[PDB]
Amino acid sequence: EGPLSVFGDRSTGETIRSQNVMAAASIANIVKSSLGPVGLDKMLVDDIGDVTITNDGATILKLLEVEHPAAKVLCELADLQDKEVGDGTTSVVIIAAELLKNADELVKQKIHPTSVISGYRLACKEAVRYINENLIVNTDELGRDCLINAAKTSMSSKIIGINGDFFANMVVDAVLAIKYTDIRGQPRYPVNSVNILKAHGRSQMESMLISGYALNCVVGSQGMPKRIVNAKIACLDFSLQKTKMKLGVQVVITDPEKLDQIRQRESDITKERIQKILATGANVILTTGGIDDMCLKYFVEAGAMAVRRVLKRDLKRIAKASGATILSTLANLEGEETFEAAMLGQAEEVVQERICDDELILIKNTKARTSASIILRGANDFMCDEMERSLHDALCVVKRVLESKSVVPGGGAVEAALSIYLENYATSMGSREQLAIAEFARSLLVIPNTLAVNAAQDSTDLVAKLRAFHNEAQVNPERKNLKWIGLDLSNGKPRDNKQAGVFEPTIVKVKSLKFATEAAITILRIDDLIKLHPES
Amino acid sequence: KTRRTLKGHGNKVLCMDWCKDKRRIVSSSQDGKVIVWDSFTTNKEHAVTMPCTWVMACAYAPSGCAIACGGLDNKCSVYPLTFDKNENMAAKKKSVAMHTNYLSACSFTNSDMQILTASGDGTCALWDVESGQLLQSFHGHGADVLCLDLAPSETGNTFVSGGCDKKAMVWDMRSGQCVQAFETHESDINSVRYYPSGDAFASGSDDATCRLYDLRADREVAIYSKESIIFGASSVDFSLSGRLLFAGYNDYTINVWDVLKGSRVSILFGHENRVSTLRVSPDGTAFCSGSWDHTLRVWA
Amino acid sequence: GHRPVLVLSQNTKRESGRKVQSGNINAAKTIADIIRTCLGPKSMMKMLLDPMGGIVMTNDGNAILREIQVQHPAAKSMIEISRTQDEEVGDGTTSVIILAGEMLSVAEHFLEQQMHPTVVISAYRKALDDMISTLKKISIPVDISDSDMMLNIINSSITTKAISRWSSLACNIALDAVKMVQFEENGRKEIDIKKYARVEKIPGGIIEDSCVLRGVMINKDVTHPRMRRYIKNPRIVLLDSSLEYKKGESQTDIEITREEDFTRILQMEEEYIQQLCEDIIQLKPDVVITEKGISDLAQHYLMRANITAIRRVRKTDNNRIARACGARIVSRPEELREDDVGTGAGLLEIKKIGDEYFTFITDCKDPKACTILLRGASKEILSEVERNLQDAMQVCRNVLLDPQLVPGGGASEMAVAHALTEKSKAMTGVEQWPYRAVAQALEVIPRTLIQNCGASTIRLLTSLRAKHTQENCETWGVNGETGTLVDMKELGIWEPLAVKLQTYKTAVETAVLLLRIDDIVSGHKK
Numbered sequence A: 001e002g003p004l005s006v007f008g009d010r011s012t013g014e015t016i017r018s019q020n021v022m023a024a025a026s027i028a029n030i031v032k033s034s035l036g037p038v039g040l041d042k043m044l045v046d047d048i049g050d051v052t053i054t055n056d057g058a059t060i061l062k063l064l065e066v067e068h069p070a071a072k073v074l075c076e077l078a079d080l081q082d083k084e085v086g087d088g089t090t091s092v093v094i095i096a097a098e099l100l101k102n103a104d105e106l107v108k109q110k111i112h113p114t115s116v117i118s119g120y121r122l123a124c125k126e127a128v129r130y131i132n133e134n135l136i137v138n139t140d141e142l143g144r145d146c147l148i149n150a151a152k153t154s155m156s157s158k159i160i161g162i163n164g165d166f167f168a169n170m171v172v173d174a175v176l177a178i179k180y181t182d183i184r185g186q187p188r189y190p191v192n193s194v195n196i197l198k199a200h201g202r203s204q205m206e207s208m209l210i211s212g213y214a215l216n217c218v219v220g221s222q223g224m225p226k227r228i229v230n231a232k233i234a235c236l237d238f239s240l241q242k243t244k245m246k247l248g249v250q251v252v253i254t255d256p257e258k259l260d261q262i263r264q265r266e267s268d269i270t271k272e273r274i275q276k277i278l279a280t281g282a283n284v285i286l287t288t289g290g291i292d293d294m295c296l297k298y299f300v301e302a303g304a305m306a307v308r309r310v311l312k313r314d315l316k317r318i319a320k321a322s323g324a325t326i327l328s329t330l331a332n333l334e335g336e337e338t339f340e341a342a343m344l345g346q347a348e349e350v351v352q353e354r355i356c357d358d359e360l361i362l363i364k365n366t367k368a369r370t371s372a373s374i375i376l377r378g379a380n381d382f383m384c385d386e387m388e389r390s391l392h393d394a395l396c397v398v399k400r401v402l403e404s405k406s407v408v409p410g411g412g413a414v415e416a417a418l419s420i421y422l423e424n425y426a427t428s429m430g431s432r433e434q435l436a437i438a439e440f441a442r443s444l445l446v447i448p449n450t451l452a453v454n455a456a457q458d459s460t461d462l463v464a465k466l467r468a469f470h471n472e473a474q475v476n477p478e479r480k481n482l483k484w485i486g487l488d489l490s491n492g493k494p495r496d497n498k499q500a501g502v503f504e505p506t507i508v509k510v511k512s513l514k515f516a517t518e519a520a521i522t523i524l525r526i527d528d529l530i531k532l533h534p535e536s
Numbered sequence B: 001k002t003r004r005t006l007k008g009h010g011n012k013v014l015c016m017d018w019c020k021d022k023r024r025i026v027s028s029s030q031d032g033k034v035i036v037w038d039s040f041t042t043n044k045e046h047a048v049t050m051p052c053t054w055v056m057a058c059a060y061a062p063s064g065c066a067i068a069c070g071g072l073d074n075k076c077s078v079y080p081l082t083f084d085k086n087e088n089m090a091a092k093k094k095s096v097a098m099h100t101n102y103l104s105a106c107s108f109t110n111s112d113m114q115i116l117t118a119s120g121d122g123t124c125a126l127w128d129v130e131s132g133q134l135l136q137s138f139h140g141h142g143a144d145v146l147c148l149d150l151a152p153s154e155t156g157n158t159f160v161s162g163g164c165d166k167k168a169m170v171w172d173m174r175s176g177q178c179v180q181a182f183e184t185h186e187s188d189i190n191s192v193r194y195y196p197s198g199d200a201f202a203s204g205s206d207d208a209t210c211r212l213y214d215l216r217a218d219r220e221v222a223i224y225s226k227e228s229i230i231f232g233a234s235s236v237d238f239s240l241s242g243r244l245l246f247a248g249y250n251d252y253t254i255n256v257w258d259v260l261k262g263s264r265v266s267i268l269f270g271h272e273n274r275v276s277t278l279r280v281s282p283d284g285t286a287f288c289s290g291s292w293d294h295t296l297r298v299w300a
Numbered sequence C: 001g002h003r004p005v006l007v008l009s010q011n012t013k014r015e016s017g018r019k020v021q022s023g024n025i026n027a028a029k030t031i032a033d034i035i036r037t038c039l040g041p042k043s044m045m046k047m048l049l050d051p052m053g054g055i056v057m058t059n060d061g062n063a064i065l066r067e068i069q070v071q072h073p074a075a076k077s078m079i080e081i082s083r084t085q086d087e088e089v090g091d092g093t094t095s096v097i098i099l100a101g102e103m104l105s106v107a108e109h110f111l112e113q114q115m116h117p118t119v120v121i122s123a124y125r126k127a128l129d130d131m132i133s134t135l136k137k138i139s140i141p142v143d144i145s146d147s148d149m150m151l152n153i154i155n156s157s158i159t160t161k162a163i164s165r166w167s168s169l170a171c172n173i174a175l176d177a178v179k180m181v182q183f184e185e186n187g188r189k190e191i192d193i194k195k196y197a198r199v200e201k202i203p204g205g206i207i208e209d210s211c212v213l214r215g216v217m218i219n220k221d222v223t224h225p226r227m228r229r230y231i232k233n234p235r236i237v238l239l240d241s242s243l244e245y246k247k248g249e250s251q252t253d254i255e256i257t258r259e260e261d262f263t264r265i266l267q268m269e270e271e272y273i274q275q276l277c278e279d280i281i282q283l284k285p286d287v288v289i290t291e292k293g294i295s296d297l298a299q300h301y302l303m304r305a306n307i308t309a310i311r312r313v314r315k316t317d318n319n320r321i322a323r324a325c326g327a328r329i330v331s332r333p334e335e336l337r338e339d340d341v342g343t344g345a346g347l348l349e350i351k352k353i354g355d356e357y358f359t360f361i362t363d364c365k366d367p368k369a370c371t372i373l374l375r376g377a378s379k380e381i382l383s384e385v386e387r388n389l390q391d392a393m394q395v396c397r398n399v400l401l402d403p404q405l406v407p408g409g410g411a412s413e414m415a416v417a418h419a420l421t422e423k424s425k426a427m428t429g430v431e432q433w434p435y436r437a438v439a440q441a442l443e444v445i446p447r448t449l450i451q452n453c454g455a456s457t458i459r460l461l462t463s464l465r466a467k468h469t470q471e472n473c474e475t476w477g478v479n480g481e482t483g484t485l486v487d488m489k490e491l492g493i494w495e496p497l498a499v500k501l502q503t504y505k506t507a508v509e510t511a512v513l514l515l516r517i518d519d520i521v522s523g524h525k526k
């Protein structure tokens, strides 16, 4: 097969370019139907009947089986966007695929790919500059209502979209509750400290935001009390079992009288440790290790609560919230074995609550630090999982809005404004990078077009009206308030989205643009593919 | 006399090893699943999955704090056996061997700082466990090397290795030379095992013959063959007292020999496929041997 | 070779569009139709064949749906919501499935008429909020201290089951068990009937002989025959540690060099057993119950003090015994205390039923755990009786926690439907049509009751709707036996408010979840 003599296939030039564009288009088209408030969820049957109902683009692309390398590039692009921002996962994939498609259309006209790449880089830089200079709103002016509007906008298109009036309040309260400050006065919001527990049963409106922490654990023994009025929480990182000598220690008995004493000590050691821990005044004992029966009996007789096999991250969060100190050993700097009362966490209550035939621990009103947890109620497991994903997206969006106090109008306003501005700007940059920047601007219009199409409306007319509004805003200095005009998908007409409360964090748009440009450049950089035959 | 069975392998059993406490039997299988089940209660103490498949090398440290494994991946790794209950055993992987061919067999030394790897590249290599670098190679067999056994009782700093080179050669780490060589099997070499005294060693071959060599005379001592047995032996071992020559065979059965006489003392069977490994428990009370029949039954 | 190039892996199908929505709605409707004929007092039993070889004669919807394997994921969602309804409230499992099927069936009509599913979902959620409001409005309070009302509620809960024949006995058993299990500690009310209300099925006898014990029952016998099988007022000591001699945790080896060391070690093993037994005896108990084995020498030492021992009892049974007799399970007998000794069991009886020995700790005073003894024709009959008793106990717990009641027999459905229809007249947008569609789709319950009874559906529903259009007629429903319109103030069929709220919520939310769904993708591996 020719003189090259390689054990594999080879596609060169237009063939491989069209293949890559087709793969990117396929990945885009899989998730294109789940964009905007009029988007719809998707089932993903997992070859064994496992069902996953989701609208999140990252989840859809992660669950799918993808073989083409460019399709992979898009899938990991979505995953990166989800990891580093948390929202806009579908938008970034759609934008990247459209950028690649238009770039290849340019290349097929004998425009060199280097010129297209240079134009794309210039367009991305200028788009980011324009967004940061003209299309941002300072959230300090709008107060707390801006956070509520941002959360509601993020939760549209999700299974909790209609219930936004309630879910946004819950999300904002949780995020504000888990807020903590560090050195140099920077306020940071450590999301993933909001433990999210799923349990089917009652309606969505009956989901609870715990003013404390929620453990997916129960008491180790039925004999313990299941409620403590004033909790003295002690956190341990070691198991409470019958102590056994380690690998380097052996028990050899020559005088048989010592065997009974040795066997007694074998459990008296743990008994003494538990006696110290109880004598310091502790009421609730949480440990990451196991607890066998005799230790449970000690806790039962002491009238205390003991929980075993607590997750390490859960234990860390509880210790941080209640002011407790994690202990891996009961050893001090004096070489002795003591437990001090100064390392006891406190809380206003610990309850063995029951949630839909199953029980869980509620640690309410931990002192010295405020913590939050959310228990989601739904019809079944799949719906609860989708609720959890949507809730995580909302939490991430609120965290971004709080950390960076800039938001941008939603509903395709930014895309239309950028398209108009970049189309005007391309005329003063080179000769072929002109075409590259024009195609970048045209590709940015795929978002409002997809939004309008998903609502079964005239996409062309709506996008034309939006472009006319934004052109008038950019041309007439006195009409600069038209930049906020976006799309009203319920009525299919242009609407001032800033007044409507449709906001997104600026970081979402900026990072999506940068990542889409980089992925498009990477794919456009390929003009030849060699696929070696597998050796299996 | 089979007393228990061990059904914990998805594919055929390739090799196994014992422990000094007689409770930490480890093994390797075709799939790449390694289990360290207890010897008595037949319960998996702890298990790990090798990322590759076709692994027939597995050794157990005399101290018991680590295990080694390897196969067609051209790789030998050390898995420490520290307690560390809240840990995945794949994280503590330690890649050691840089081999250009499949690893036929690996073994520890009495001190858990060296491992000897016999591979299909025709060379046996010595690796320092701690530092992880190659100690010294052993140029030798012009073909694949299959078996590898360390001497007991100081090892004499010596070990023997055999393969399809038609000969078994004794080496010396203190000088890195083939001090002794024996070429009398007329077939492929499969297994080798030192006599308990350490001055002799038996070897199984594909000609269904078991041969005993005495290092104090440099000549074969006793032939162990029968016209009934036509399938080559795959494993061989000695009794603790040194009077029996437990040997594994591909005839689905196990042939028992007498070191002094070799007069067909007994025979046992039970496996539904080829026997791949056969090791004697350190206490000498009982023994065990796996097979390709997916089982690793134990005889007492 | 030149293998084909493709984006997604092979065997990765993908559907989209109107076909997906129609298929989902059809799957839900099929699931509903499977158990449609199992609703009401005149429901027909269904006979299921377990893959392991068992037979499940049942009428409960959840059991039927959990014994059925399906491939369409919408059917899987329906099975999951049935399980959710069964776990959350305990009954209403076949009502919620029918309701969800009907709402999806009426939503398909709007999907086919160029209406986006988001509008339908918004209308559904508004309708659900108004249903909750109306149901809370038409509810009535109930005195939980009145035994007659409790028995009547449980009866209305079990008139539709196979235990309707012995309804009186069933209601008494369920009420007594639920009231007995109810417990309060540290200011925390608790009704744990899944743990401390055990149902034991012994085939044979007559179902009229089945009764709830004032104590517990286990399938255990005395370890040694010499032990007494009848103690009047036993002091019970519970253990979860072996009364044997066992090896320690550390590796321990003895090195014997003198002659007497072997015999001395054996003698000290015996002495250790004797010391444990003496520590047990120091409290002067009458019966010792352990989760782990008791050695023969320990049995001898216990019989020396006239103590009955039970060898190996499960953890849950031991917990129930502790709750019933007021004991406290302890591990090390040397730490045994007087408070841990369980006094309060008024009798310990060990009698033979058939060819097995059963231990009775009945006659307890103020017990917090009960064993429901069921005797009947065979295993399947007793299993169905147990399921009906579970439904009754769940209903009793729901009423105890929520003392509100709503009329049954379809009266609540019609009342809520009429209220929703009247409220829809103010609505002017396009959302009013699906709103009214859900309102009248709520009417499937009385329609199914009338269909099962065998009467004419069209005229009965028309007359019932006409009656409900009047002012004070929220309690007018149908008879499931005579197929006539009656007043539940006279018929006496009432249901807990919590059950109806959960049913409506689950149905509407299942409809919303399946309406949100499009573009099914399948075939991908893990």
Ligand SMILES: Nc1ncnc2c1ncn2[C@@H]1O[C@H](COP(=O)(O)OP(=O)(O)O)[C@@H](O)[C@H]1O
Pocket (backbone or CB within 6 Å): A034, A035, A036, A037, A055, A056, A057, A086, A087, A088, A089, A090, A091, A092, A152, A153, A154, A156, A157, A409, A410, A411, A412, A447, A451, A487, A488, A489, A502, A504
């Ligand atoms: N209420 C609303 N009205 C109009 N447009 C909206 C509204 N809510 C969200 N959008 C727009 O829908 C687009 C799609 O967002 P979505 O697809 O949910 O995010 P992701 O891409 O992370 O899944 C966003 O760009 C946003 O501007």
Ligand SMILES: Nc1ncnc2c1ncn2[C@@H]1O[C@H](COP(=O)(O)OP(=O)(O)O)[C@@H](O)[C@H]1O
Pocket (backbone or CB within 6 Å): C038, C039, C040, C041, C043, C060, C061, C091, C092, C093, C094, C095, C096, C156, C157, C159, C160, C408, C409, C410, C445, C449, C478, C479, C480, C481, C493
């Ligand atoms: N005597 C009766 N007359 C008319 N309807 C009744 C009567 N008893 C119960 N019902 C109705 O039958 C339904 C109960 O049927 P059931 O099989 O328990 O369904 P589910 O399993 O969903 O609870 C209730 O909706 C109730 O209104």
Ligand SMILES: [Mg+2]
Pocket (backbone or CB within 6 Å): A087, A088, A089, A154, A393
């Ligand atoms: Mg989003």
Ligand SMILES: [Mg+2]
Pocket (backbone or CB within 6 Å): C091, C092, C157, C158, C160, C391
């Ligand atoms: Mg019922």
